[PDB]
Structures are given as C-alpha cells and as structure tokens.
Amino acid sequence: RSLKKGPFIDLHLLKKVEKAVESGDKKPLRTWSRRSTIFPNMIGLTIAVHNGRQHVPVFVTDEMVGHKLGEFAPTRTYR
C-alpha cells in the first residue's frame, strides 16, 4: 500500500496472464486471488473470481485498473 513498495500481485496469476496474452486466444481464467491488483495488461480478458461458493466472471475494462479483483464479486446474499 505504501507507494515505495509498488503494487501487489500473486506470482501465479501474473504468469497465467502473461501466457494468455502471448498465446492469444483464451477462455476464462479461474482464480482464488481476490487480493491482487488489476494491471493495464489485463484489459479485454475474462477472470473468474472466487466468492466462497462459485466463480464469478469479470470482463476487464479500462476503468477497473487500480482496484483489487475482489471488489467485483460480492460475498453475502440479501434481498
């Protein structure tokens, strides 16, 4: 969080993203890592984020850059 430390990401997620980009086409990328930041090189992909029970698909656009992956997958049910 301190600026002198840089953004935080999970190593396996970073490698998966790099492979998908370089190899071109992709199907949704499954992940349990809600504590990772959204990097500019993700725009246009589909990440399926865990919420406790299911994986929720998030289609990454350019207004999401800088937020954590967990803000787009609510955990509690209410009506």
Binding site: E63, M64, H67, E71, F72, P74
Partner: protein, 114 residues
C-alpha cells in the same frame, strides 16, 4: 461583495467571511489573505475596489462552486456505473466505509420506519 458568483457578508471579519464559498475553508482562507496582503481582522465593508479585485484574482486559482460540484457528482456516478462494492452501497443507501448496521447508521438510513 460579489466574489465567485455569490454575495459574502459585509459585517464579519475577512477570514470568517471568505468561508461562505463552497470549497474554501479556514486554511485556504488564510493562504488567500496572506497571498493578497490583507490582515485577517478587517471587515469586508472597510475595504476598497482594488483590494476586492485582488481577492478575486487570488480566489480564481482554486476549483470552487459549480466546477467542484460537477467533479463530485462525476466521481460518485463513476463508481455507481462500475458496480463495485462501494457503488452498490451508494445506490442501496447504506454506509460505505465499513461501519456497523445492526444498530445505528441513521445518518445514512434516515428516521425509523415501523
């Protein structure tokens, strides 16, 4: 005296009077008066046109009134459209910064409904 599209009181001291503008607090008021060269305990009715114009020029350097209001509205609309946790809270009408809801929360809810 008209400054930023509004009238400001003429019987107060300058440092208090200048806070009637939307976007100017105590610290910014002190900075404005220091940069303009006017004391803080001088009533607005004991000044001159040149001094008031100096104040206008200094106040022009910040974002105030309509511009600031538009900025804030766009800030909130962005989140609401994005659909993150904060946006969902904003459009449900509940606290945003993680406060309790089992009791209290009445500033964001309103008076009770039986």
């Amino acid at each position: 005296a008209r400054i930023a599209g509004i009238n400001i009181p003429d019987h107060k001291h300058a440092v208090i009077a200048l806070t009637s503008i939307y976007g100017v607090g105590k610290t910014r008021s002190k900075a404005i008066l220091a940069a303009a060269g006017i004391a803080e305990d001088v009533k607005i009715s004991e000044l001159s046109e040149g001094q008031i114009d100096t104040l206008r020029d200094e106040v022009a350097k910040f974002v105030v009134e309509g511009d600031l209001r538009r900025e804030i509205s766009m800030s909130i609309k962005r989140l609401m459209d994005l659909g993150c946790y904060r946006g969902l809270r904003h459009r449900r009408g509940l606290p945003v910064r993680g406060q309790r809801t089992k009791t209290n929360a009445r500033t964001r809810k309103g008076p009770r409904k039986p």
